[PDB]
Amino acid sequence: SNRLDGKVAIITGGTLGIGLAIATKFVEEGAKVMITGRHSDVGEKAAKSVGTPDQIQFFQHDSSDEDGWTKLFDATEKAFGPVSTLVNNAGIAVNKSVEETTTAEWRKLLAVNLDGVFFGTRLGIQRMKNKGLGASIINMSSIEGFVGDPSLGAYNASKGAVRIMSKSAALDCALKDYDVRVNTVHPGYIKTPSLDDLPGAEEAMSQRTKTPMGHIGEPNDIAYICVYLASNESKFATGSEFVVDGGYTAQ
Amino acid sequence: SNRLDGKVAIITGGTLGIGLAIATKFVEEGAKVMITGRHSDVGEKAAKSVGTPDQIQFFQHDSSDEDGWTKLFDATEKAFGPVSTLVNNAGIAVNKSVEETTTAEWRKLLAVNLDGVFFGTRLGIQRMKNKGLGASIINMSSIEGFVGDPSLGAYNASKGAVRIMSKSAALDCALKDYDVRVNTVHPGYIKTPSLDDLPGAEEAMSQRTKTPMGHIGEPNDIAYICVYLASNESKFATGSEFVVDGGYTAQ
Amino acid sequence: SNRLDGKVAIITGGTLGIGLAIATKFVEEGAKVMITGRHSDVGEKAAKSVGTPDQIQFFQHDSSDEDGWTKLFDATEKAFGPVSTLVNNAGIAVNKSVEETTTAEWRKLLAVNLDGVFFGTRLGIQRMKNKGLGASIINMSSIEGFVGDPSLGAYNASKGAVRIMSKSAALDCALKDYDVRVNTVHPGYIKTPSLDDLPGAEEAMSQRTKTPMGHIGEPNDIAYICVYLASNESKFATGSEFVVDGGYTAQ
Amino acid sequence: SNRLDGKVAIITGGTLGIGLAIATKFVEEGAKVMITGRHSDVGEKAAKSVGTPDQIQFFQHDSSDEDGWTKLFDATEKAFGPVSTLVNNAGIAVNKSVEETTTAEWRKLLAVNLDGVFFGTRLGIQRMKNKGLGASIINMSSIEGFVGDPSLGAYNASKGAVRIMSKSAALDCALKDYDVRVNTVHPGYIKTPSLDDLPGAEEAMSQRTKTPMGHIGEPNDIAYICVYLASNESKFATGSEFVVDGGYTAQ
Amino acid sequence: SNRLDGKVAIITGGTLGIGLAIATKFVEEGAKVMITGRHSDVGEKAAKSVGTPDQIQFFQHDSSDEDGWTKLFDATEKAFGPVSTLVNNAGIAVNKSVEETTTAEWRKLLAVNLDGVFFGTRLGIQRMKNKGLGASIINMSSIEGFVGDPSLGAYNASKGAVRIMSKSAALDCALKDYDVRVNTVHPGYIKTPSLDDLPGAEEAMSQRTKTPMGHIGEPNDIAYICVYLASNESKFATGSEFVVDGGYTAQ
Amino acid sequence: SNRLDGKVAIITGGTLGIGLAIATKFVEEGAKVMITGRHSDVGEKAAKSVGTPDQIQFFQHDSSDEDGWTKLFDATEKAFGPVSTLVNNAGIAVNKSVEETTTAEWRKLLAVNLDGVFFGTRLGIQRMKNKGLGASIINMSSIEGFVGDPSLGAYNASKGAVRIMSKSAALDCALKDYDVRVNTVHPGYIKTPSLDDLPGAEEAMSQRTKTPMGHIGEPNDIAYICVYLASNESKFATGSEFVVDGGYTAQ
Amino acid sequence: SNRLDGKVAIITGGTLGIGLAIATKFVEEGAKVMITGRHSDVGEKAAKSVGTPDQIQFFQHDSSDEDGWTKLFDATEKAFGPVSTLVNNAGIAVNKSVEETTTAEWRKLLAVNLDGVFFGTRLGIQRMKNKGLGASIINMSSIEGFVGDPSLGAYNASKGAVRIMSKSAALDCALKDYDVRVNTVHPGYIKTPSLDDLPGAEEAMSQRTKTPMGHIGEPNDIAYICVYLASNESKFATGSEFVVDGGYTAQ
Amino acid sequence: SNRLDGKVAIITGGTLGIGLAIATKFVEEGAKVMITGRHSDVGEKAAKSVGTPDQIQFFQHDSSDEDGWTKLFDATEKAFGPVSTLVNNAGIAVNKSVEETTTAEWRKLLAVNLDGVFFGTRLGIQRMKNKGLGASIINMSSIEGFVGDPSLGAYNASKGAVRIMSKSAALDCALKDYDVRVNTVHPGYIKTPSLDDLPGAEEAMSQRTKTPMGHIGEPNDIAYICVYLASNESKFATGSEFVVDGGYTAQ
Ligand SMILES: [Mg+2]
Ligand SMILES: [Mg+2]
Ligand SMILES: [Mg+2]
Ligand SMILES: [Mg+2]
Ligand SMILES: [Mg+2]
Ligand SMILES: [Mg+2]
């Protein structure tokens, strides 16, 4: 324990599901955390349920709002000191094939899943570089950044852009000695509130033809791999992809 | 010869460089072609230099214009009959790291390199499916869809989105028996007019630490692989990536 | 036509299935060919069925026989002149998991699928370099060099070694200006005699959960991609992997 | 701490370099360990330097000795109880291109780097399955299982086989509910004694064109990622590849 | 009473403030109403507080979502029959001068105040024309569509676009005999929840130099003028502007 | 109904056309009315046709007679109690351009259309202020107070003066807390007897280039807008212009 | 310079304030001018102070004298040739609300501000039409022809009539091809002798709540806009209003 | 002449039509000018045809490109010194009713006609304020910012936003003593290259029912009014609208 001693972390969309589990384990390991979300009653209840205000707080912010990113970092710095860790987790999904995707659907999904991650990654580098913090940016992609799905058109493009954009960021901060690492995490199917939104997807993706283990994962499975990437145990890991999918992409 | 017997092809950005070479070899192999571009004097001169109006014509169209895509297909169908082949080639580049990319730069590059390819891929599936044409959509990505470059931030995201979005399209048309194939092509550094725009990039990317062959490629190197993917010799190839880079990604 | 003008090619295991199709299309495109195999009566009948002795001949040779490789190159050079093209095609498969694979089974498969390809690649570089031939070595891997299968343990290991060993050879001949290219081809499931070793594989791999097109391929699907790699159209392609699998690895 | 509570681990080649660091961190986290090697005086000194005989012991064994693998499991089970974790770490390297590799060199490297890993993986599945141990087999590959190097011919082939063979094992134990996970670790260049086999490799691979961070790693960088894969935090990770290379493969 | 006999109305942003007052008086006068909003708990409570489900219901919808507009009209038609009245009320404000407005602020405000009104006005004409319904589209502009305010830059542009765009719509449906009227409403300062968001604005805008009446208005003041424009008493009014501002624009 | 509960209204020129319709609807909504005119036999018949003497009565008075205005207010107050509402409606028109207007024509039209409205507005403020009546003065202007007509010279000037003079009165009664509101109504072309003064005006102004609806209005179209302005629903409306013209001024 | 080459202009009330400045700039730009006024000693001194008798002269005339208008045109034509330009500038103001305006005050102001402008506009059209002069009539209105003031009752009415009457004249001379243009100028508060009629108006109208620039204008500000309207640069401008008020009417 | 002595002006879209005429007259009056456009051959030819490089130059720039605005001002400052005048002229049109406007058409027109004008107005204020330059921003709206047209939906909204946004800018720079004036110009129909794009619109808009003068204007008609607004003759004019339309809006 205390594998994240002295760290200051922002976690976008950390009030439910995967992000909420990441926040819980981060606090358990010594970090001070700021979770974000769009609904404030859910968000404040989530922060209080994990710990005290000097351990974790909430900040209402839509990841696609460019102006909010500056206020988010200022607030976190004011409460806990300089930020050392960023988890770009907030994202959404659309159940459409490329052929049947409306232009409205296309723009709204990429505004969050791609533009938002770019806004945070870009400002994270500026604020955390050259400060001896052992900085780490963790961008949440997916197995849909490796393989395609016939009814996840815009989502496939979303996560593929994230996959390769982070490699470019990682190289720039390593060649320039910024003391910032960038890595991507690729979950399989995990039981979260948003997966209950796609009816019957859990049973379909628990078949052996899809997930060889015959079942899907839990939010803590993604939390543990991000503790590794946020801690100084991973000080030699940058620009790499980490897959936790129960065998999905192995076949 | 006549490996593309009876085919009807649209090639976006086919008035210079890589696209112009693709158009030349397509006509040489029996196809009827419509090249697009933004400058009309250059475009008409390019079409006439390759062949007669019953072999190839020009259509002024910005790939990021959504309304133009419908008029482009209607014009090509009126001149040559139903379209069977689409090459999503038009793209642009920005010499910026993720840290130093303005939001304006970000939006303009993705409007062409990602939104445009999506507009054509989406409408191509609708117009070419279920017609016995042996249809083929060829999306131009890059080696920057595999590896990152520290000063090609938005470009890396552009080509990564293209890489995985085409896999989703390929699966949807195969599971539904659409008679449409989708594949991506990943060139290395090729001597084109736009590469002279980035000063001294040719000599830098001809070092052995970058391109093991000690030199860069020519536009015909990309033309030949797209004749294969457009012809019926590749009738079992869909959702795959084809790299022609002189060894860049092998090390 | 005559895309392989003036080329001299060795094709191991060219008396059945994929190799016989490669040999057929090579002769049709102007090359002169020497196919190998272990049974000589089938082999002589195979050569005669494709063309006349001044177009194609047969040479009895076990791919795992190290000393025979020198006699194979000497015989082919004597009949047709200096060899310019090598296709390491001969291979076998066993339907066993890693847990239940005997050491005897393990050793015999790697002797053919790995040692044999190494014997040919090593001597091919020595014999074809620095002669202005536009030489090309094509090593036959598989989709099983990309993904795993629970009942193809030793076969998976063989084909993964071929995938990465060819990258090393390709880099060495490019950095040293040898005028030799090395590339790998990765077929999906193809209807050949070798499918009798995997009982029931055609029906099993024709499900949509396996091959999205709902069917498996034919030997000519692999022949056409090897015409491209053997011809000078691919003079900028080295160290790359080319997949023709009907969508198998895209999901 | 005690992230490896109650685990029993075998680490081949755990008397130097990476393996010794894995053994050190395993004991620190609660596991009981048996390290192997060929020289017994160094091995006994190595075990004693890490802890007491009830924490860690040594067993003289050549990874290529098939019969010794059964005695290795019997000895470890007798001292500590049933084995739950296996790290196939022992390996060697040779600085030779494919063109200039002797058959003797080829056979000896694959006997250790490939046959040895196969011997352990095969018997590990048999001995650890269906016992509620939360078993985990970690096979040591490399970045040379992803990209090629012009002077690592046989080493590239070895490590590529390990990469894809482990996927096959992982799928078999997940589809059959064996309670065994299989994953591979791919280190970059790490300062170990084994670097004396590649002369001048530290200075060569510390150029920015090779490792973007401008330096190579230390053995503890690989130890921490193997603690994650050996613990139950990774219970949803199987058949995956984890890269710790300082940015090497991102460009 | 029953001045709106038999009418079916959609009111965007009708769960608070001005829109909520419009909805209340509409139901009181015989109309059947569907109010929209982004927060569903507030929205459902608002609908129930005004009347029964056969008088008024709620529909969660962001006016800037183009796809939602079609579902909004379908839902209202399913519950109450064909829609006859549309009130484009939802809007937001930003306290910035033109000089100090960020591009992010600019785009977000116009996405709601201009794009949203255009989406509803465009689809309203298509759905309500040529059906004998006595249709009426009421677009909510402001006094800031007549005069400027030094710290309401984007808002001034928002409401000015609405003012003149509705004139074009009104003329098109009158020249074509569509039986659809379009008019704009221009409130002064009204005590609503969003006016409490701009601190001290109420006291500042209640000075006689600003509002000659020495006080600001109440939500019912805007409700009554929209009952007139929705009823058949205004059957000769189209393309006109109606100001209720307590004298603001008279001086 | 009873939207004008307890109100006492004077309507000049209420024996024909627009004024008679205003009087009719005023009584229907609870007000008690005194209509004026110059011919007494028509006037008495008009009053009786609308209702009983305790609802509406007639008073012979020329709007340009200054002394008669005091007797008009005294008579109305004696019959119904204190007056709360005034509609300055009486007016006439002449079909002449500025170039060909006689001074006699000029003086007579402004004596009625301007001097008369001034006489009533001035005395209305004096008599109705500071009595808690919710007083409202409605001055009848026209679209000819907004745009010009080449053959309505003197009429244009009259109606433009009314438009801006009422703004001045409205401001004075709001700054001084008089409890009196002043507003103007601007009708388009309405079918009344007064159209005999403009020969052929109905057919001329019913062209689409003039009134977009293709027809002119009826007197009730103006009556309804004056019910709103006379009732307490408009208690926040003062100094404003309300146009009911069938789209005339929108183009 | 000489922007008014060959023009002959009458300027009513050109012996003080705004008119004297218009006369000064007119002569400087080549026009020959006749200024009018009621006091002849001031008028003769004013003419002499601007230039010589062959450039500018004086004519004693009260703008409300109808018969004098014919002698004014005859005198000016005799001295300089046919008149081409008329500026209806003479006007007066009274500081009274509508409620407290005497009928005597009302009649005298409209006799000058309205009847006088009508007398000149009517005869100007008759005398200047159809002579190729490029004629231009400029009627002086005010911001008080746009907005109301609580203590400028009769003045507001005068200036509103001028605003709309000039539109009617402008249309008549354009539809009939008279070669006469009519336009209005609307000044803000300007420092002139006429400000003694509104006591304290300079300090009152220099507050930022009134004139945003914090000061009032000078007579030359109005002279320059009348040079444009009198010259042939404005040959496409007719029936329009030109405001020079320091921002007064923008808020 | 030299009414624009010592001024430095940027004119967007000044290579054709209205802007080209504005540039010509500006140079004639002493200003130094930088015209912008998208086509560089047309643009350079336009600059040279008006004057020498020390009088006028060209700068390729799309007004909708946000990044280009900073480079445009820097270039003009480098060639001529600090900029004092900005003319936001570049705009485009779409021939669609609100009902039949595609979302693509809507976004593209507003990107130029509204976003572009905002980009220049915002940066113009920052660069020209508080420098004693007598700065002037002239925004090109239209008569379609006053009245509507049934087939100019997006254009009507474009010009209405411009009309009211400039009022807000004018007030902010006057209240803060910025020495910057903002005004809008509203042309009628003018014969330009883009008006020949709408076939037969010239004859339709030259009818007396549309333009009372029976003809349309020429580019110089708009040039002259912008010389007035750019010169110090208009130092008291801010936040006002200037119409030159041949009587269009007067009826
Ligand atoms: Mg986008
Ligand atoms: Mg797969
Ligand atoms: Mg690399
Ligand atoms: Mg009009
Ligand atoms: Mg005002
Ligand atoms: Mg917009």
d(CA F98, CA F103) in angstroms, rounded, equals 10
Nearest in space to C233 (alpha carbons), one of B56, B229, B30 = B229
Pairing verdict, β B180-187 and F85-88: unpaired
Cβ(A146)–Cβ(A249) below 8 Å: yes
The whole-angstrom distance between E28's CA and the closest CA on chain H is: 32
Chain H environment of A104 (Cβ under 8 Å): 103
Measured CA to CA in angstroms, residue D178 lies from B133, H55, H151 at distances of 49, 84, 71
How many H helices and E strands in chain E?
Answer: 8, 7
b/e code A104-122 from CB counts within 10 Å (16+ = b) = bbbebbbebbbbbbbbbbb
Cβ(B141)–Cβ(B185) below 8 Å: yes
Cβ(F219)–Cβ(F187) below 8 Å: no
d(CA H125, CA H118) in angstroms, rounded, equals 11
Residue E64 has phi, psi (to 5 degrees) of -80, -5
d(CA A8, CA A13) in angstroms, rounded, equals 16
d(CA D157, CA C161) in angstroms, rounded, equals 4
Alpha-carbon dihedral H142, H146, H150, H156, rounded to 10 degrees: 60
Nearest in space to D167 (alpha carbons), one of C205, C147, C187, C114 = C147
The answer to whether the CB atoms of D247 and A228 lie below 8 A apart is: no
The whole-angstrom distance between G60's CA and the closest CA on chain H is: 31
Extended strands (E) in chain H: 8-11, 32-37, 56-60, 85-88, 135-140, 180-187, 241-244
The answer to whether the CB atoms of C147 and A251 lie below 8 A apart is: yes
Pairing verdict, β F180-187 and F135-140: parallel
Neighbours of D100 (CB within 10 A): 13
Q: Is G102 annotated as a binding residue?
A: no
Residues 6+ apart with CB under 8 A from F207: F214
d(CA A117, CA A92) in angstroms, rounded, equals 12
Residue C234 has phi, psi (to 5 degrees) of -100, 25
Cβ(B224)–Cβ(C234) below 8 Å: yes
The whole-angstrom distance between H85's CA and the closest CA on chain E is: 16
Architecture of domain B8-246: 3-Layer(aba) Sandwich (3.40)
Architecture of domain D8-250: 3-Layer(aba) Sandwich (3.40)
Residues 6+ apart with CB under 8 A from A24: A50, A223
d(CA G137, CA G125) in angstroms, rounded, equals 8
Domain boundaries, chain D: 8-250
DSSP string, E126-146: HHHTTSSS-EEEEEE--GGGT
Chain A environment of C248 (Cβ under 8 Å): none
Neighbours of E118 (CB within 10 A): 24
Nearest in space to E35 (alpha carbons), one of H56, C14, H125, E46 = E46
d(CA H233, CA E154) in angstroms, rounded, equals 30
**Coil/strand/helix, residue F76:** helix
For residue F54, count CB atoms less than 10 angstroms from its CB and return exposed for 0-12, middle for 13-18, buried for 19 or more: exposed
To which residue do tokens 């503890």 refer? D220
d(CA B17, CA H196) in angstroms, rounded, equals 35
**Coil/strand/helix, residue D96:** strand
Contact C/D (≥3 CB pairs under 8 Å): yes
d(CA A223, CA A245) in angstroms, rounded, equals 13
- DSSP code, position E115: I
Q: How far apart are the first and last CA of chain C?
A: 36
| Tokens at H143, concatenated | 């008569």
The answer to whether the CB atoms of G122 and F144 lie below 8 A apart is: no
Nearest in space to B243 (alpha carbons), one of B108, B142, B109, B154 = B142
| Tokens at A121, concatenated | 């990654």
| Tokens at C158, concatenated | 């063989």
| Tokens at H240, concatenated | 């006002």
The answer to whether the CB atoms of H105 and B67 lie below 8 A apart is: yes
To which residue do tokens 């103006």 refer? F222
b/e code A136-168 from CB counts within 10 Å (16+ = b) = bbbbbbbbbbbbbbbbbbbbbbbbbbbbbbbbb
Catalytic residue flag (residue E248): no
d(CA C220, CA B233) in angstroms, rounded, equals 8
Neighbours of E196 (CB within 10 A): 10
For residue A193, count CB atoms less than 10 angstroms from its CB and return exposed for 0-12, middle for 13-18, buried for 19 or more: exposed
Measured CA to CA in angstroms, residue G26 lies from C52, E115, G133 at distances of 106, 50, 16
Nearest in space to H30 (alpha carbons), one of H220, H179, H232 = H232
Measured CA to CA in angstroms, residue F22 lies from F93, F141, H78 at distances of 20, 15, 69
Greatest alpha-carbon pair distance for chain F in Å reads 50
d(CA D244, CA D237) in angstroms, rounded, equals 17
Pairing verdict, β D8-11 and F180-187: unpaired
Cβ(E221)–Cβ(E244) below 8 Å: yes
Pairing verdict, β G8-11 and G32-37: parallel
Cβ(D84)–Cβ(D133) below 8 Å: yes
Architecture of domain F8-241: 3-Layer(aba) Sandwich (3.40)
Q: Which residues surround ligand 1, an ion (CB under 5 A)?
A: A 110; B 110
Cα C147 to middle of ligand 2, angstroms: 7
DSSP string, G87-130: EE-------B-STT--HHHHHHHHIIIIIHHHHHHHHHHHHHTT
- In three-state form (DSSP H/G/I as H, E/B as E, the rest C), the secondary structure along chain C is CCCCCCCEEEECCCCCHHHHHHHHHHHHCCCEEEEEECCHHHHHHHHHHHCCCCCEEEEECCCCCHHHHHHHHHHHHHHHCCCCEEEECCCCCCCECCCCCCHHHHHHHHHHHHHHHHHHHHHHHHHHCCCCCCEEEEEECCHHHCCCCCCEHHHHHHHHHHHHHHHHHHHHHHHCCCCEEEEEEEECCECCHHHHHCCCHHHHHCCCCCCCCCCCECHHHHHHHHHHHHCHHHCCCCCCEEEECCCHHHC
**Coil/strand/helix, residue E54:** coil
d(CA A235, CA A228) in angstroms, rounded, equals 10
d(CA B62, CA B39) in angstroms, rounded, equals 10
Alpha-carbon dihedral C153, C157, C160, C166, rounded to 10 degrees: -150
A148 to chain C: closest CA residue: C251
Tell me which of A172, A190, A236 to substitute to probe the interface with D (most D C-beta atoms closer than 10 Å).
Answer: A236
Cβ(D161)–Cβ(C157) below 8 Å: yes
Cβ(C154)–Cβ(C109) below 8 Å: yes
Strands of the B85-88 sheet, one edge to the other: B56-60, B32-37, B8-11, B85-88, B135-140, B180-187, B241-244
Q: Is B196 annotated as a binding residue?
A: no
Chain A environment of D214 (Cβ under 8 Å): 174, 177
Measured CA to CA in angstroms, residue E74 lies from A118, A147, E34, E133 at distances of 37, 37, 11, 17
Q: Residues, chain C, total?
A: 251
Interface partners of chain F (CB pairs < 8 Å, 3 or more) are E, G, H
d(CA H23, CA H220) in angstroms, rounded, equals 10
Phi-psi sector, G177: left (phi>0), alpha (psi -120 to 50), beta: left
**Coil/strand/helix, residue D90:** coil
Cβ(A242)–Cβ(D234) below 8 Å: no
The whole-angstrom distance between H251's CA and the closest CA on chain E is: 16
How many H helices and E strands in chain A?
Answer: 8, 7
Pairing verdict, β B8-11 and B32-37: parallel
The helix, strand and coil proportions of chain F, stated in percent and rounded to the nearest 5, come to 45, 15, 35
Measured CA to CA in angstroms, residue F101 lies from F107, F154, G244 at distances of 10, 8, 31
Residue H43 has phi, psi (to 5 degrees) of -65, -45
Nearest in space to H89 (alpha carbons), one of H141, H50, H130 = H141
Residues 6+ apart with CB under 8 A from F45: none
d(CA D165, CA D119) in angstroms, rounded, equals 12
Size of interface A-C (CB pairs under 8 A): 11
Which residues of C carry out catalysis? 155
Residue B176 has phi, psi (to 5 degrees) of -100, 0
Alpha-carbon dihedral A221, A222, A223, A224, rounded to 10 degrees: 60
Nearest in space to F150 (alpha carbons), one of G132, G181, B193, G167 = G167
DSSP string, D157-172: HHHHHHHHHHHHHHHH
Neighbours of A179 (CB within 10 A): 18
Nearest ligand to the C-alpha of residue E116? 6
Resolution in A: 2.8
Q: Where are the alpha helices (DSSP H) in D81-152?
A: 103-110, 116-128
Residues 6+ apart with CB under 8 A from E89: E11, E12, E13, E14, E18, E19, E22, E140
d(CA G144, CA G148) in angstroms, rounded, equals 6
Q: What angle do CA H232, H233, H238 make, to 5 degrees?
A: 80
Q: Is the dihedral of CA B241, B247, B248, B249 positive or negative?
A: positive
Alpha-carbon dihedral C109, C110, C116, C122, rounded to 10 degrees: 170
Structure solved via: X-ray
Contact E/G (≥3 CB pairs under 8 Å): yes
Q: What angle do CA B152, B157, B162 make, to 5 degrees?
A: 125
Residues 6+ apart with CB under 8 A from E201: E189, E195
Cβ(D8)–Cβ(D80) below 8 Å: yes
Q: Provide the angle, in degrees to the nearest 10, between the axes of the packed helices B219-230 and C219-230.
A: 170
d(CA B206, CA B215) in angstroms, rounded, equals 5
d(CA F30, CA F36) in angstroms, rounded, equals 19
d(CA A188, CA A219) in angstroms, rounded, equals 11
Measured CA to CA in angstroms, residue A93 lies from A151, A155, A168, E71, E108 at distances of 10, 6, 25, 19, 22
- DSSP code, position D239: S
Q: Is the dihedral of CA F189, F191, F194, F199 positive or negative?
A: positive
d(CA B184, CA B170) in angstroms, rounded, equals 10
d(CA B211, CA B246) in angstroms, rounded, equals 6
d(CA B140, CA B192) in angstroms, rounded, equals 15
Cβ(G47)–Cβ(G35) below 8 Å: yes
Measured CA to CA in angstroms, residue F70 lies from D29, D139, E47, F73, F77 at distances of 105, 109, 53, 5, 11
d(CA F18, CA F220) in angstroms, rounded, equals 7
The helix, strand and coil proportions of chain B, stated in percent and rounded to the nearest 5, come to 45, 15, 40
To which residue do tokens 């475009």 refer? B43
Cβ(E147)–Cβ(E210) below 8 Å: no
User: Which residues, listed in sequence order, are joined to residue D56 by a DSSP beta bridge?
Assistant: D33
d(CA C18, CA C46) in angstroms, rounded, equals 13
Nearest to D147 among B148, B149, B250 (CB): B250
- Rounded to the nearest angstrom, the gap between the alpha carbon of residue D160 and the centroid of all alpha carbons in its chain is 14
To which residue do tokens 């001299």 refer? C8
Cβ(F85)–Cβ(F139) below 8 Å: no
Q: Is G246 annotated as a binding residue?
A: no
User: Which residues, listed in sequence order, are joined to residue A8 by a DSSP beta bridge?
Assistant: A32
Residues 6+ apart with CB under 8 A from C28: C1
d(CA B135, CA B84) in angstroms, rounded, equals 5
d(CA A156, CA B167) in angstroms, rounded, equals 8
Nearest to A98 among B110, B125, B144 (CB): B125
C178 to chain B: closest CA residue: B213
User: Which residues, listed in sequence order, are joined to residue G241 by a DSSP beta bridge?
Assistant: G184
Cβ(F202)–Cβ(F211) below 8 Å: no
- In three-state form (DSSP H/G/I as H, E/B as E, the rest C), the secondary structure along F104-157 is HHHHHHHHHHHHHHHHHHHHHHHHHCCCCCCEEEEEECCHHHCCCCCCEHHHHH
Chain E environment of G205 (Cβ under 8 Å): none
Residue C33 has phi, psi (to 5 degrees) of -125, 145
For residue G5, count CB atoms less than 10 angstroms from its CB and return exposed for 0-12, middle for 13-18, buried for 19 or more: exposed
| Tokens at E163, concatenated | 């003012």
- Rounded to the nearest angstrom, the gap between the alpha carbon of residue H237 and the centroid of all alpha carbons in its chain is 17
